[PDB]
Amino acid sequence: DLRLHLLLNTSVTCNDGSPAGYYLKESRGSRRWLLFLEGGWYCFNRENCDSRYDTMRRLMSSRDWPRTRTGTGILSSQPEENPYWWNANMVFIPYCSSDVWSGASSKSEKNEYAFMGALIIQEVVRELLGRGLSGAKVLLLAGSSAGGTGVLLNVDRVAEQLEKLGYPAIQVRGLADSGWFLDNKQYRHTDCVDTITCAPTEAIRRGIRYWNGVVPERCRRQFQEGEEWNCFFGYKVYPTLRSPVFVVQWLFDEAQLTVDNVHLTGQPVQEGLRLYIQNLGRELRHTLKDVPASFAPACLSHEIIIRSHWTDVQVKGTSLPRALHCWDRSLHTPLKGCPVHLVDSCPWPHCNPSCPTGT
Numbered sequence: 001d002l003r004l005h006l007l008l009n010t011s012v013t014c015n016d017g018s019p020a021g022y023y024l025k026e027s028r029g030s031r032r033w034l035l036f037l038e039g040g041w042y043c044f045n046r047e048n049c050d051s052r053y054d055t056m057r058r059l060m061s062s063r064d065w066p067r068t069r070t071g072t073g074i075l076s077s078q079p080e081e082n083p084y085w086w087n088a089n090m091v092f093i094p095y096c097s098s099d100v101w102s103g104a105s106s107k108s109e110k111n112e113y114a115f116m117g118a119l120i121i122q123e124v125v126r127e128l129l130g131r132g133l134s135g136a137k138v139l140l141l142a143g144s145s146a147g148g149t150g151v152l153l154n155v156d157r158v159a160e161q162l163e164k165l166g167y168p169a170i171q172v173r174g175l176a177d178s179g180w181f182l183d184n185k186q187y188r189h190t191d192c193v194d195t196i197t198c199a200p201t202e203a204i205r206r207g208i209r210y211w212n213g214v215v216p217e218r219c220r221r222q223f224q225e226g227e228e229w230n231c232f233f234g235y236k237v238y239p240t241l242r243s244p245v246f247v248v249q250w251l252f253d254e255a256q257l258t259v260d261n262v263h264l265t266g267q268p269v270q271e272g273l274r275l276y277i278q279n280l281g282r283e284l285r286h287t288l289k290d291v292p293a294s295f296a297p298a299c300l301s302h303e304i305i306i307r308s309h310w311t312d313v314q315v316k317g318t319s320l321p322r323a324l325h326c327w328d329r330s331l332h333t334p335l336k337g338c339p340v341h342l343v344d345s346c347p348w349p350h351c352n353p354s355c356p357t358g359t
């Protein structure tokens with residue numbers, strides 16, 4: 001179990017003004033710290049956020065949070081479930097800002113909701129320093145889905161935060177799971193009327209203005225004022241980052257296909273949709289060609305690293321926990337039989353036999 005701690009700074013809040021927080025399971029004598037960013041889509045206007053508040057309220061409020069959570073996958077403390085960092089200090093940061101961890105806006109007179117995702121991360125790091133993070137040697141900022149994109153948006157700010165607070169020895173690194181999306185065209189066009197089927201570009205363009213979202217500085221300097229939505233897309237923001245970032249992404253990510261208005265029905269796949277799915281797989285594969293630390297299996301799925309069976313998937317015979325361990329060694333010339341760049345080359349969902357079954 002990880003134990004809940006609500007933030008002492010109650011100005012840093014979830015959407016509805018309730019205090020944000022984090023779940024912590026300490027490991028004394030370990031200088032490794034894993035801070036995981038939960039995912040869970042987003043909402044980019046009052047109408048959609050109101051709907052999210054009656055039926056997905058735990059993603060917008062801490063009022064009903066349990067006082068403990070069980071660590072799973074990379075957050076598990078059992079070596080059997082987590083061969084990678086089973087002995088690390090475990091932190092699970094709940095996603096309650098609906099802003100892809102980008103917001104820096106307080107609830108106010110003029111704002112019905114607070115979007116403080118970027119400030120929640122900064123405040124968690126600040127309050128953890130008094131609980132042992134000051135003695136850390138590696139801080140791995142991880143996250144899945146919207147949390148994976150949040151890693152790309154915030155990993156360098158965490159590094160700059162610790163540097164300015166006087167902790168230059170803490171190595172900040174990023175692990176982005178299932179947050180590497182493409183601003184491609186939809187298979188069938190919709191007008192952006194709701195969340196899940198809104199095209200990627202239009203959803204973020206509306207969200208960043210609604211949340212007062214912040215992006216990494218160097219990426220902001222490239223795309224400049226009004227075009228900061230570009231920095232939510234991994235292949236554009238990754239080359240501007242300086243912290244080492246390991247990228248985990250299914251080649252045929254289900255959330256990517258959802259915003260692309262692709263609904264795989266079990267029905268026969270016609271030529272047009274077959275070419276679309278195969279071309280989507282190529283575009284990931286191409287966008288990851290120059291990403292030295294990456295794990296990209298050819299599967300139709302979504303999220304990996306906190307699933308209890310995340311150890312099962314392999315690319316070229318290497319599991320993700322092994323690839324991450326190889327990444328650790330590389331950050332001490334390639335290593336003999338311990339690879340870090342693992343991108344499937346086969347063109348169709350589940351051509352890798354180790355893909356998740358969905359059972």
Ligand SMILES: CC(=O)N1CCc2c1ccc(Cl)c2C(F)(F)F
Pocket residue numbers: 039040041042100145146147149179181182183199200201203204232233255256259
């Ligand atoms: C489920 C989720 O969290 N998704 C899916 C679409 C998406 C997410 C997160 C960040 C971004 Cl940036 C995008 C986008 F479509 F805009 F690419």
Ligand SMILES: *[C@@H]1O[C@H](CO)[C@@H](O)[C@H](O)[C@H]1NC(C)=O
Pocket residue numbers: 009011012119123
């Ligand atoms: C609480 O957080 C806000 C926003 O990050 C900051 O401006 C303020 O100084 C913090 N309060 C304390 C007491 O640290």
